[PDB]
DNA sequence: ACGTGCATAGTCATTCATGA
DNA sequence: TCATGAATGACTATGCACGT
């Protein structure tokens, strides 16, 4: 039996699992801005195939799948995380399309996998964009049986998009969500001003990026907070919802809530408020009553007494309830497998970098593919312009071998391509075929020459990344909800 | 006549609802927690409220009576209706003139109306007497249309009917999202189980009628009692024309 | 608003549920022996490639698959039923092979799904057999979008072999499982005596099955309740466990079980004993101490007083205890899609119809795949002969639909044929591989011969289900394990 | 000599020997492990308690919350000795208190936690070297023809399936290599003969030498100071590896 | 009254960091 | 003290028929 002393023990195991927590656990990547579970179950319904262009999947068969592969934990956790991310009051842009009960901003928990489908949503496609093209890092899963992405293409800002939260160990992360049109401006100059400093590019970026844009409207008050975020990394952004106080004809005055801020729970709200009424701490108030439905949206009336104004009751709600709370920001995330607090430059830059890198790698794996198969098409034209020979051959032979053999003594020919020369079909030696073949060889090498093109001038790549999420954004972008008001 | 509907002595599983006029509330008995989620959501909170029923229900046919009072499930539409049982029975405090049973389109679902209607029958009888029971009929199909609204369908023929009629008419649906199957209730949202059971200028309820007493006590308790050999022999005698029953 | 009556609504929704429950659920089909949640599990895995011949998959990927394409029901129960399908104290011959934590015959519940895998065993492997050669009507799933087997090849007799228990509407199972070499015999011997009158068949049947063999050994007592199960299709079948009396050093006798009858839980039953000797019903017994381990199975050491008879105390723990416990045979199956008490002979013969269905059906799928690859090779051969005509029509051809048209005329044949010709590689023109297409066609002609011999004589047919069988005897099939004595 | 349970915790599986000095308690992460070691133990020396979820960090909580804790009284009250100056190591009911949990971090943080619930409850278990931790396989290699070897590191997999090969074995590449990732995927048997069979577990003892050194590190990682524990891991996480160098 | 097996898931308690 | 969100599932109750 070996000794081992309680510090050695202490020290090494506690670290081994807060630094599995901070990298591979609770923080986001800064690229893809995504913690593993997520990329897991993303890329699990990727490869299932359970794409908008199909029917929803059953959701434990996308839980089951990111369980089997990738995800060596929990059914139940796993299906919490991938229902959070169908749910249009969590992620300001959903990744998962859930068809069924996937729950409600209040109390009301989502349905159980049974009840439940599930499939990827087009922006979470472009998350996955091209990922077989060689375009990011794969590496083996928790038992080698198959590989997984160790980051996704992403090919629209998703850290900054959809945000993110998450408690680790001597850390925790807190990045609010954006809107993405705001976020594409923002790359777009980051893009065109490639060389710029770090000192114009975030008074650059601050400019077209007004503050977060959160799922659930509402609104925010000041701009230091904002400010602070994007310069120092951490700030304070004051949240408030939306009250619209209607007189009825008895004379009897009541606030209608349509809006709350990001992260209040509706159910919770209305019974903080009774119970401060409850106990008398918000006079003023009259009557609570929860009009809302699914056809009219939050609709919580507080009516008022008589004796009582307005805005004073609305001041102690914002005072003594969640009607105004503030965002503590922490732009914490993962930069290289390092934790690390950014400025909102270096998140875009960070987030242009990594879309460069995509692009590159793209170009050079189609480039190869392309020299691969152009390459096997010179051998397919050879055959053709002297076709009359070719068969001949063949037939003499007394294995394929043979043939093969002869083939290259023919035409000065590769093995792989007097073996595709051997794979053609009787189908392709009709006219408009082997013309087909031809103007393809013709097709490839003009393709190649735009590939040996784009990897030569940066100027491209970087017009590659703008127009392709442009492109994106013109389909997918969407109004701003969050109004932002001054003090 | 008016009470007062729970707002922050009833059942916890209960969303009521927040008419107190008992003539024009309704109560919706469904099945399985998701269901009474989505219908809590997609409901008009105004005069309908959600009792989720958890489970298949106690037959009180079978159980003694003690062990039936003692059920949770049981207890909460006793109490949500607020009428006694037996000899205690006062349709004056019946909380809502309308007890909907929404149970799966599933076999599952059908078994569990025959359990709640052999509660009724025997601890409420009143209640279905008065025609304050009825049953709704859930969607079987949702028709998804690529540029038209949706259409839901609750049978096999229906939607053959609208899937025609639509195509003829120049409609057109994908061969993949196509139509929507629904297996049960848990499978939908909160506007789906409005705009097809609870909207009241769409929903399709049958209101449970009793017409002769004896005849129903006796089949009550063929059907649900302790005898075996009495169920076994009318079934087996009876399901060979169930399907020519409204012929 | 419509009007129903509560007599309708009653009577025709209580009869859908007996039926369906019946019929669809508890009660299983007399062919395989399979209610539709086993035979969904075991298709699902099947089509899923969870087979023996790889490692074992994440037992929640079979679960999600059953529910997503088959079984449209809770998760939970079906990762119960599959557990069930891979204990070996419940299955007599288990159809599926679990690795991890799958509980025990006491109270120690299985794993949860997560932490188990699963695959098929080779015997399942067999209920499964050629499922993909028209062997067995498929319907469409619970949606449309699949097809699921109605039944399942079943080249061993499941039901006999593993049992069924089941509680439906009006009416119970309860078959219990068999020896399958003993099966086997009764099989060989229905096969031979095709024409022999129940009567006969149930005299002989009778003398070969000997009685039933539980996975969990033990012994039956008696041979009335075996032989009334048999020619009744009821019977009660007394079971009992093994004792085995040892002496101590001082002097003092101990009783050890080491064996208890079919289902009945051993902590139960060791709690049954000591909350009856405690309360003074046991008298004679001293001390109860399990010495069960995972390495000398089931040990439940009785030591009895020194004024105790051994029998004396076996005997009360026959009376007062489960280690004397009766199997209420009832042999109840789904026959034609109705319930039906079946006699022993009916069971078998029953089985052999099913077997003979496949064999026949599987030829018929053969011999119509054999004509269709005949068919087109006919068409190569004729290209052969004609080859530098059928070359040089093609390559004259300014599409391939001409070129086509053309073949069809030329060599008078099919455009099928003609198809085959056109996606001929210029591989097949090498001398050797002219010749494989003409040995070919002379290997299939061959072989459609002997197909068409197989559906023209009912003997072969009844041959090949005896040989298939007793290889799969020979292969999986192993000693009795209840042992039979008299009373 | 302590009377076996046939007033204890409802989980505890109870070894059947009723000498302490002889018994064995195993500390085991979750339900399904605790189920496996139950069924694999030798129930005569090895008692079983599973622990469900994360353990209450005792450092942080407040002691009244501490001991309204489930799995903590489950502990307290199977090792049979009291807590803090009510300790009483006379009346300890076994004088071997394995701690297995998973070969994940998850079951690591699991260990930091139980034995912070120890050194800060129940010190002296720790200063008399009664307290250990099991080490569980992560491999399972699976030859053909002969029986098949548990690995307990990357390295010691790599060396027998080196020996094997060059011994004549042979692996199928299809089951190959089974790798746990916790106690829960294993069954009894494979539990026994790789954690809980005497002649062949490797176990670990708990020594404490600087009592007020380990006071502070318990105090720095486990207290509610974060940015204690925060510069500490940016410190001391660099050189993590390099610790018995 | 209990076992059987296929059907009809929410609740319960911790780690961890941060701000009310 | 509470919310956040990924991490570490056993227990609870009915139907249904049948035999001790
Ligand atoms: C909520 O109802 C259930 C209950 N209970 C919980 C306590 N109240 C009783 C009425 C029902 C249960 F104790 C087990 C299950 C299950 O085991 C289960 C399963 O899927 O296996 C499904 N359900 C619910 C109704 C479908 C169950
Ligand atoms: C048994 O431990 C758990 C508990 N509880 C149950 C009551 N005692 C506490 C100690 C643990 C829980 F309240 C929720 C979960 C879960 O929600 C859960 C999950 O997978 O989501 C897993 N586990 C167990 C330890 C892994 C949970
Ligand atoms: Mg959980
Ligand atoms: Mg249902
Ligand atoms: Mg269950
Ligand atoms: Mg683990």
Known sequence: ?487 | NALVRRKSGLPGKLADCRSTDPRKSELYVVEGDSAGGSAKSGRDSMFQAILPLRGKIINVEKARIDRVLKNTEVQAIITALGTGIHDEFDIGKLRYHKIVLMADADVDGQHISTLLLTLLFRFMRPLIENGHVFLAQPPLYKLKWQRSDPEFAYSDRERDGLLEAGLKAGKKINKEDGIQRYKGLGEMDAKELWETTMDPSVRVLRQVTLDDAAAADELFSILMGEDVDARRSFITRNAKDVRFLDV
């Open chain 1, 1 to 487: 039996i070996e000794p081992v002393d309680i510090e050695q023990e202490m020290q090494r195991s506690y670290i081994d699992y807060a630094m599995s927590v901070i990298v591979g656990r609770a923080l986001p990547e800064v690229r893809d801005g995504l913690k593993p579970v997520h990329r897991r179950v993303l890329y699990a319904m990727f490869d299932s195939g359970f794409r908008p262009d199909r029917s929803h999947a059953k959701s434990a068969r996308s839980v089951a799948e990111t369980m089997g592969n990738y995800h060596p934990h929990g059914d139940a956790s796993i299906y919490d995380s991938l229902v959070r991310m169908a749910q249009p009051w969590s992620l300001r842009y959903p990744l998962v399309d859930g068809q069924g009960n996937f729950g409600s901003p209040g109390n009301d928990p989502p349905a159980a996998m049974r009840y439940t489908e599930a499939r990827l949503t087009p922006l979470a496609m472009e998350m996955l964009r091209e990922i077989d093209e060689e375009t990011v890092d794969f590496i083996p899963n928790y038992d080698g049986r198959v590989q997984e992405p160790t980051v996704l293409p992403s090919r629209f800002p998703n850290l900054l998009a959809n945000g993110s939260g998450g408690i680790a160990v001597g850390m925790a992360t807190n990045i609010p969500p954006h809107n993405l049109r705001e976020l594409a401006d923002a790359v777009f100059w980051a893009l065109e001003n490639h060389d710029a400093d770090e000192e114009e590019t975030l008074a650059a970026v601050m400019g077209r990026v007004k503050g977060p844009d959160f799922p659930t409207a509402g609104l925010i008050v000041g701009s230091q907070g904002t400010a602070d975020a994007y310069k120092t990394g951490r700030g304070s952004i004051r949240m408030r919802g939306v009250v619209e106080v209607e007189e009825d004809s008895r004379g009897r005055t009541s606030l209608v809530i349509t809006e709350l801020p990001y992260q209040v729970n509706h159910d919770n709200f209305i019974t903080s408020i009774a119970e401060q009424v409850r106990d008398g701490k918000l006079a003023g108030i009259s009557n609570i009553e929860d009009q809302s439905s699914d056809r009219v949206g939050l609709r919580i009336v507080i009516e008022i007494k008589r004796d009582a104004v307005a805005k004073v009751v609305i001041n102690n709600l914002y005072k003594h309830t969640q009607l105004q709370t503030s965002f503590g920001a922490n732009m914490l995330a993962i930069v290289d497998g390092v934790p690390r607090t950014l400025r909102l430059d270096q998140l875009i830059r960070y987030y242009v970098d990594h879309q460069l890198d995509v692009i590159v790698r793209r170009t050079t794996y189609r480039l190869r593919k392309a020299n691969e198969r152009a390459h096997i098409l010179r051998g397919l034209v050879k055959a053709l312009d002297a076709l009359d020979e070719v068969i001949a051959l063949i037939r003499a032979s007394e294995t394929v071998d043979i043939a093969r053999a002869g083939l290259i003594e023919l035409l000065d020919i590769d093995e792989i391509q007097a073996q595709a020369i051997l794979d053609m079909q009787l189908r392709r030696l009709a006219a408009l075929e082997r013309q087909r073949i031809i103007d393809d060889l013709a097709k490839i090498e003009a393709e190649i020459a735009d590939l040996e093109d784009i990897l030569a001038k940066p100027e491209r790549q970087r017009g590659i990344v703008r127009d392709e999420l442009a492109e994106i954004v013109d389909r997918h972008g969407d109004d701003r909800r969050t109004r932002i008001i001054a003090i």
